[PDB]
Amino acid sequence: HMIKNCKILNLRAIRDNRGSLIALENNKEVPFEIKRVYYIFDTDPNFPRGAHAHKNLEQVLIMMSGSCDIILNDGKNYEKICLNRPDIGLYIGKNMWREMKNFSYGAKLLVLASDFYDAAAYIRNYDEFLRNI
Amino acid sequence: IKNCKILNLRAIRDNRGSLIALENNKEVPFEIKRVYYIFDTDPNFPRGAHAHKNLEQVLIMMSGSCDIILNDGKNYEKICLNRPDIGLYIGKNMWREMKNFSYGAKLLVLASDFYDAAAYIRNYDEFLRN
Numbered sequence: 001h002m003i004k005n006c007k008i009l010n011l012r013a014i015r016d017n018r019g020s021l022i023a024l025e026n027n028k029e030v031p032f033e034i035k036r037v038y039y040i041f042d043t044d045p046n047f048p049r050g051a052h053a054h055k056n057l058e059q060v061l062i063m064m065s066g067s068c069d070i071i072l073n074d075g076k077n078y079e080k081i082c083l084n085r086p087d088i089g090l091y092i093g094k095n096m097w098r099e100m101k102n103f104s105y106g107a108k109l110l111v112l113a114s115d116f117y118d119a120a121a122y123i124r125n126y127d128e129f130l131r132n133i
Numbered sequence: 134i135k136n137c138k139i140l141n142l143r144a145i146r147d148n149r150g151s152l153i154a155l156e157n158n159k160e161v162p163f164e165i166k167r168v169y170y171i172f173d174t175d176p177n178f179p180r181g182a183h184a185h186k187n188l189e190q191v192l193i194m195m196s197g198s199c200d201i202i203l204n205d206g207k208n209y210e211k212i213c214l215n216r217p218d219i220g221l222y223i224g225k226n227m228w229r230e231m232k233n234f235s236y237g238a239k240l241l242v243l244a245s246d247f248y249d250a251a252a253y254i255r256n257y258d259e260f261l262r263n
């Protein structure tokens with residue numbers, strides 16, 4: 001796989017008989033400062049999300065339940081990645097096009113974001129994404 | 134009670150699902166320095182009760198349910214968390230006991246500070262004093 005700005009984070013759970021606990025801290029497990037946490041639930045494999053990019057926004061994606069595929073695209077290379085467990089995090093860094101699909105029904109995705117929500121930061125035209133690479 | 138509030142989180146719902154977002158000093162009254170989550174839970178194995186002096190937290194039941202018994206020194210309250218569009222803000226100086234997790238429930242915690250092993254106040258009388 002040749003995509004530069006992403007990384008699989010095989011996170012460390014602490015397990016005991018009460019359950020499993022995973023923790024992520026700014027500039028530690030997450031290579032940025034958390035400004036925003038959001039989560040998506042009530043998902044459906046017939047209803048993918050839209051492809052778009054961001055410029056400066058970084059994220060870490062954790063499948064809290066169920067599964068999905070993320071197609072990542074750096075302008076050059078693309079890679080499909082299945083998220084299907086809550087102890088794996090997908091770092092998506094700067095200048096990445098991505099598209100999330102095949103959510104198992106009712107799957108839940110947790111996202112840690114480096115910056116606040118801004119609809120203007122979504123790049124929906126692929127050619128515009130290329131140009132700014 | 135005291136330093137604690139049920140947050141009705143606003144969700145965006147469309148045919149792809151529902152999204153809820155929480156942002157530093159907006160939905161959450163602090164800078165989120167840490168996020169953790171607990172899963173693989175079991176109604177037989179409650180968490181130990183304890184307090185924190187300065188840590189603030191927002192809890193969100195991502196799946197399933199649990200009971201949080203809050204104690205401010207004077208009073209106590211049970212809160213059943215059971216839906217993902219509700220958060221529980223737990224402010225400073227609060228004793229809490231989490232219990233009664235439905236099997237495999239999952240709880241998301243947003244925290245105002247980095248994890249500190251010796252910031253747990255695990256003795257109630259000791260809590261009362263300070």
Ligand SMILES: Cc1cn([C@H]2C[C@H](O)[C@@H](COP(=O)(O)OP(=O)(O)O)O2)c(=O)[nH]c1=O
Pocket residue numbers: 036038049050117145152154
């Ligand atoms: C990521 C995010 C999305 N949203 C909104 C924008 C959308 O209506 C909805 C779903 O987000 P998203 O699927 O990211 O964008 P779009 O639907 O425009 O492709 O949630 C927020 O309100 N806050 C956020 O932090």
Ligand SMILES: Cc1cn([C@H]2C[C@H](O)[C@@H](COP(=O)(O)OP(=O)(O)O)O2)c(=O)[nH]c1=O
Pocket residue numbers: 014021023167169180181248
């Ligand atoms: C909350 C938290 C706990 N942990 C660890 C410490 C504990 O061994 C385990 C469970 O924590 P927790 O239940 O808060 O403490 P205790 O087990 O002492 O009641 O997870 C972290 O590593 N980081 C964290 O942010």
